């Protein structure tokens, strides 16, 4: 006649259905936090591509402009 | 002149400083979702907890009614 | 003449690539930090599936047990 | 009596304990992966700062040997 046991069990049973449904939804946001972490890395790191060679480019636009100097320097008086 | 080299090295350092702005407001939106991860992960965890706990609260509910049930059995005829 | 001007621009130019070497290298640890995430979050996800689905598996053998149990009851004396 | 409903039921009740156990082993490890991507983001924007800090510097060495120059040829023959 008692149906205490089976009362606590289908609750239990319930609750965990409750808690798989929550758990999915939390996972579904994660994969959205997921997908802002890779784009916002991928931005930081074409930045910093461009930047170093950005700054290799002008280390040649200087050697080239000193190089024009040391050939315009050879028709000094000396 | 010549100031070829001079342009060229403030263009760079001008460069340096907008590409730094930008990166900082890409660090600033990935601080937020370092933010949502952990609150993604703590939430999950809880969950975790929770559900644990309620399985062996029904463990201990199911142990008790037993132990009950052996207590109403010795006033049976035997 | 005077080349303090050169030598403090030099210097930066020097730096800039230091730290866009050292911000690639960063990057390049937070790509697997976002693989070790992702693995995580599917591993979880795994589980969750399986477990919703392992509920209502439990729901269902408990519903066949019960409907065997209307037609057990059928042959008893009434 | 027949014990198909208890052991189904008791069945599941364990296996959800041994699945909390393991997403929280996955937790754990989740964790440590939120502290490396902290961790990476915190040395992007020191390097961000000191960068920024240090194109300034440079900005500011430069308009001070600028003055310099400016106060010396007051000095020339005009
Ligand atoms: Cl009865
Ligand atoms: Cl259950
Ligand atoms: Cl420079
Ligand atoms: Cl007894
Ligand atoms: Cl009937
Ligand atoms: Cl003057």
Same mark, same amino acid.
């Given at each position: ?16 259905? +409750?808690?798989?449904? /929550?758990?999915?939804? &939390? ?7 997921? $997908?802002? *972490? @890779? !784009? ?5 790191? +074409?930045?910093?591509? /461009?930047?170093?060679? &950005? ?7 200087? $050697?080239? *402009? @000193? !190089? ?11």
């Amino acid at each position: 006649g008692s149906s205490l046991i089976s009362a606590v069990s289908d609750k239990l049973r319930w609750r965990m259905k +409750e808690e798989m449904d /929550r758990a999915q939804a &939390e996972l579904n946001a994660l994969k959205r936090t997921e $997908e802002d *972490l @890779k !784009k916002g890395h991928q931005k930081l790191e +074409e930045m910093v591509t /461009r930047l170093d060679q &950005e700054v290799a480019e002008v280390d040649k636009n200087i $050697e080239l *402009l @000193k !190089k024009k100097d040391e050939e315009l320097s050879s028709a000094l008086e000396k």
